[PDB]
């Protein structure tokens, strides 16, 4: 069934996040580039969470091709999918009016990531780092509407 | 087998309810959505129950799209499928004269939904609200006819 | 070894009775429905028995699909699986001269079906109920001819 | 393999005898029926034995159809395929000169088949029932030629 | 891989000898036989041994049909499996100059075969019973050349 | 996917390194030779590490052919994949601005390879030797930029 | 993969050596053979070792056909692959400049092969048999260049 | 646990009845048989079912021993073992006021035995045998006092 | 510790209630009567759930035996342990100031049993009847404090 | 449990007959060898079956020793151990009034032993020979006094 | 070894906290009650995590018995053990200069209990309340040193 | 039992060949030769077969020591082990009138040792050498009486 | 032997370092702590590796108690554990003239620890900090001899 989806340039991502699946999406993204350079694309999500290493693995590639990328959320969305959520163009990041989002987290390597990560997410919104930190270690489930003020999303339908 | 089913425009849902199967239905709903808009679909059920997180993971979708969705019950319809039953169009919610139907049922959020749920059926059914909580916390298996008076459904053959 | 069955439409029902198969049969019955309004089907049987839920689950379906149904028995005809047997049309029921057919058997519910069940099967012939509760609680293997007198069958080759 | 095996109207029966395989042959025997009613077919055997129930399940079915059935034996055939061997048309039961076909073999009905069964083999040739019960209770491996005097077999090669 | 193997009318017999494989060979031999008789066949072998009940399940078959059969050996030609080597036509049984061959080896009937069996293989060559039991009960590996004096072989490249 | 991407002259290498996968890459590398050998190709990477033996197995193969090979890194690159990274042509190899590498690790046979392996990597980057072995045994996760002055990689976007 | 691969006269041999693969390969030799006895075949190798029973199983075949055979090694090559390495025509046995080999490694029959084997390997190259024998239980891993003195091979690119 | 349990002449029988335990239950009886003919013994029950052949292994054993036996019941007296409830003396067979009890069930011997057993109550309980057969074929449970009117039980508590 | 436990005349019961464990319990009680049937006994709990049929295995023993019993609760008591919490000497049933407690739950038998319980607790508590079912059929956890004013418990600590 | 049995000079044999258990029983037999060869023993049985080779492992053993032996049967006497029923003396072989007993069963020796046994029982029963094989080859169950006519049993109870 | 510990009044608690283990502790605890009022058992810890519902079960017991208790920590103290650490006397709660203690975590009940914990530690620490509730949900491993000033620990070594 | 087996110098060896019986022996040979190397030690057998290299672990051990040894057989003197039958004092090797004893079977070693044993039994029996070569390579059973005439056995019973 | 190992104050530590084993070793130290604070103790090692977090669970304890400790090494002294080599008295650290010793290796805190150890050994050995650091971070397996002068050990044997 996943195949027949792909015939009009749509993807799904809901199970979990490892390295094995990570190789699939990148490959999926790469096939879709070499058939046309400009046919718009979307992305649908319903995630539990994930590791840290692949979060850049996808963001770098998404920032790489000829065409653009849109994003959509569904219900639950974790720390990782959140970063993926605010990754397409600014006014193509829709959601649903029942959805939750959260934010949450071989040594000297990683400390570059948690800082590099915040640099992105605190620059697409304008919100400064002081807002980020105390709201990044904790766990408080925002909603659809209040997230818009936070600067993750443009216009719920 | 299923390849021929979808050429007619029909879905099945009868095993149980997790995130895994929940990930599947959405895609099928999304498949036909891009094939045609003038293709009001049906939906059959034989459910034991389910979780809560996917409950408001479908009604979110079913409300949006250009087509409309009828739905039908068979045998035993549980808490979750019930919320799905009285969820499509006003006058396209049929059932059968042998059909058991009943109605019943991180921490800082789940307590919000079952007030959001009960905020639904009081509108669809017209019924008041406190009548729900004495009926929803209890267990009283109803049937075709006597469940009609609540206003879950609209017709039978 | 199923494709050329459904052309020259025929079904088989041979292993046992659970919810899993219960969802399969209904679909095949639904396959023929939207394929033709007239394709009088048959149904061959070899059962050990089953549960109570799927039993009336099917009999309702057989009547919603007014395109007519024929039924045939083989060897051993079990409990509720055999209740299907007389449930088809009155003059399109048949069996074989080597065959047995045996009849016997979440609380307030089930006590109704064993009344609703006998309510049906005693109306096909005109037998009382108390004649049934002598026969249904007990166990006595009958055969082709001696079971005809109870009034299950209409003819035989 | 079993496809082109079957496109020339031929079957195998080699492993053992359960209900699972029993449900399979009946279907094949029914496959060929609706393709042609006069394409008189054959059947090969290499059996260890089996249960009691399906023995009748096949013999009645052979008798139900219009076309004719030929049978052949190979090596071993215990007292469940042997019944099948002497069940096709009289002038079409062949065998081989290296073959051992010797035969030896809820409650209220099991005793009946062993009488109904002996009714056949004796009525097939004309042997009495004591000679039947004398050598049936026991086991003594007869062969190709000496089997012929019983009346099982007509030809050989 | 099989689809092209059986094309050109060639087979292989490579692992071991049970009842399961025994049904596979006969079926193949029959499948070829249902096409053109004049499609002269061959056969290749490499075996560790086998049982006896299937040893005289094939020579029966190989000897009836109109098409002639050629046989070739590889490596270790062990018991029974070797008995087929001499069982083809007299002027085609080739072999290889590296290949060994060993010819060693209910309780009223199995004893008959070891007499039936020796009678064949001695009549094939004209090598009396003295040579048989002297060499059959024992274990002595023979090569290409020295095997030829027994008359197993007829030629070689 | 694999048939779908490989038709576009692309490869992937994501999991880990054994002998079995080593046999697959060569096979892919050889399938793609004969089909238009003027097609320059690529190779994408995401590696945890691996053994030593295949490391040469690919590098020697890469030179045997007529076509040419470009290479790209993603995120994490291990010791061997790094050797692969500096395997292709000069200004036809790239990386990403969020990635890193790492370079560290039947007796005599192993020992020679550490030299020959080190031999190549020093005669590609205009670097001396003690610069290498000193940084080899240790472990220091470098970046995009500082790698470029280390003569591994260039021409990044 | 192997389908569109195997068209162009190529095989692989990567994992290890048992009896099961031994039968699989000979088939591949035979499929290309009767399909086209003109196709100049080739062969590639990578092995840890093997048994002895299958070494002669192939070399007898490799010569038996009409066409020719070329052989190539990569990296590692074991005792059995080595004998196979010197199986093709004198001027079509190449290798790679990073590769090695080794030459090393019921009763009455197995012993003959160790002597039969050495007789081959000397007459193909010319060296006396004792010097050949003398390093045939001594493990001492050789390279590309120093192998050429033995006459194992004839040319590297 | 039971090192002290057998001391005091006490038993428990709580799980089921198969071949394993039946042999074990025996060994408990006659370890005590040697010690005294006067030291009385008790016996407690809680069964969910029971076999048939093993049932006539114990009532046999329970007679022709020196010591005297008493019995006490609990909960759900399933079948067969129950027969054991009526196995001691007319005034040593107690029960409890929440205890229910039911009574239910080669060919030449099995059909013989469940008739022999009825003749055993041609000695004990509800005299009019023809009415012993009236009940055991039926499925309807009983209570303590509702069962006293037969004579299964003699001193309640 | 467990042999030391029973010598202290103390029990623990904290995992679950099935058929297996229930037989272990009944033994322990009477075993304390084995040494002395005049000795005050304790009984502690911490249960997550409970069965139903096994519940009417224990209540009688607690009333059958000679000695007196006291009961104490911990943490979470499901449906059944509450019945046991109110089962002992009146002024000998205690609890802790954290012990949440709740009370919750063939066809001709089961529906009879859960009327015997409603028939009871009004006698032990001293409360009405249909106010029992008014709360027994729902789910609402009652604390320690609000349980005292009910009547379940009478000396807290 | 069993070390106390052996200190009672008593055995049990109730499961089956294979290689494993027979090695145990001889040792149980032989434990008393080191003890006094006085102090006669007993032997109890309940077998569903039995092998043949192990049967002639025990019969001899009973005669080699000095002690005298008696035997007692229970329920069913499958075969081979059964024979052991008639192994002691003509006047120490008791039974019970429900104990059904039946009789039943390399080439060069397996034939030889079922002949050796038939040579025996006529010495123990006193009956002829060719009536033994006439009756042992069939299958038919005989009760106690049905065997007392023969001599298998000598003092019933 | 643990069987010897209880004699030298000491516990270890080092793996985890689930249902099974908790019942050991209570049992391990109260056995030592009567043996001395001034037992003042030690209690050692090294846990990686902790549950929530089982935690309260211990606190009541620890603050129930007549004996006193002292507690000592080792390294990694997860969420719950911290509560359990402070559970003791004001001056008998020691630690080590190497350790790291952290603080971390039915909706009508589960959410309700962490209220009760936050209600407590301000009594043991003397610190305020709502400063707990903001610093408890975050994650910052505090040392031995900086954890003294709160009041968790009362002496060091 | 198993020490009490060792008690009064007795062994059993009845399953198969394993590497662990010398361990069971050297206590005896050392503790008894310390006590008295002349007492009645014994050894019993019942084997289906054995290996060849393990056999030359024991025959030496039975002669390195001072004490004397006797040997007794049961039935299957399978192979190798048997050698052990004739491996004790020449007048202490008994047997039974029921036993089907038989005798049967790197490279530089294994071909040496089956010759070594052939060099022995002529010393223990008294027969020639090359008659052994022809009588062990074959396979024919010999009884007790047929074996005494050789010299394997010296006092029957 | 293991209780006897604990006797005369001896330990072994030879498999690995994980969570389970660390707790035993602690308890082993603690049982010995109670008997005397002065009876010295030994400690032996042979480790293949070692964790990090578990390592800072022991060094404290070995410094905590009153008794002294002396330590001895064997062969492969891996990472972490070894730290324990130099974790006793200044002059009771022996070794063997055959052994090879190595010294090797949340993010906010783990980075504290592998620096915290580097804080130590300049104190335990006496060598400056940076030297310790670089040597510790490479792989350089030192001997007994050359590892003495670093100061890890001060006597050999």
From Swiss-Prot, chains A, B, C, D, E, F, G, H, I, J, K, L, M:
EC main group: hydrolase
Active site positions, chain numbering: 79 (nucleophile), 104
Organism: Bacillus subtilis (strain 168)
An example Gene Ontology biological process: protein quality control for misfolded or incompletely synthesized proteins
Induction: By heat shock, salt stress, ethanol stress, oxidative stress, glucose limitation and oxygen limitation.
Reactions the enzyme catalyzes: Hydrolysis of proteins to small peptides in the presence of ATP and magnesium. alpha-casein is the usual test substrate. In the absence of ATP, only oligopeptides shorter than five residues are hydrolyzed (such as succinyl-Leu-Tyr-|-NHMec, and Leu-Tyr-Leu-|-Tyr-Trp, in which cleavage of the -Tyr-|-Leu- and -Tyr-|-Trp bonds also occurs)
Annotated phenotype, changing residue 35 to R: Has peptidase but not protease activity, activated by ADEP antibiotics
Protein name, entry field: ATP-dependent Clp protease proteolytic subunit
The EC number(s) this enzyme carries: 3.4.21.92
Function of the protein: Cleaves peptides in various proteins in a process that requires ATP hydrolysis. Has a limited peptidase activity in the absence of ATP-binding subunits ClpC, ClpE or ClpX. Has a chymotrypsin-like activity. Plays a major role in the degradation of misfolded proteins. ClpXP is involved in the complete degradation of the site-2 clipped anti-sigma-W factor RsiW. This results in the release of SigW and the transcriptional activation of genes under the control of the sigma-W factor. Probably the major protease that degrades proteins tagged by trans-translation.
Domain comment, as recorded: Peptide exit pores open in the compressed state; in this conformation the active site residues move apart and the protease cannot be active.
Gene disruption: observed consequences: No degradation of trans-translationally tagged-peptides. Triple rqcH clpP ssrA mutants cannot be generated (ssrA, or tmRNA, encodes the SsrA tag added to nascent proteins in stalled ribosomes by trans-translation, targeting the nascent protein for degradation).
Family note: Belongs to the peptidase S14 family.
Pfam families: CLP_protease
Subunit structure of this chain's protein: Fourteen ClpP subunits assemble into 2 heptameric rings which stack back to back to give a disk-like structure with a central cavity, resembling the structure of eukaryotic proteasomes. Forms large heterooligomeric complexes consisting of an ATPase component (ClpX, ClpC or ClpE) and a proteolytic component (ClpP).
GO molecular function ontology, one term from the record: ATP-dependent peptidase activity
Any GO CC annotation of this UniProt entry: endopeptidase Clp complex
Top-level taxon of the source organism: Bacteria
PANTHER family: ATP-DEPENDENT CLP PROTEASE PROTEOLYTIC SUBUNIT (PTHR10381:SF70)
Regulation: Low intrinsic peptidase activity is stimulated by ATP-binding subunits ClpC, ClpE and ClpX. Activity is disregulated by acyldepsipeptides (ADEP) antibiotics, which negate the need for ATP-binding subunits for activation and which makes it into an unregulated protease. Each ClpP subunit binds 1 ADEP molecule, which prevents binding of ClpX. ADEP binding causes conformational shifts that open the gated pore of the ring. Protease activity is inhibited by diisopropylfluoro-phosphate. Protease activity is inhibited by bortezomib, an oncology drug originally designed to work on the human proteasome.
Entry's localization field: Cytoplasm
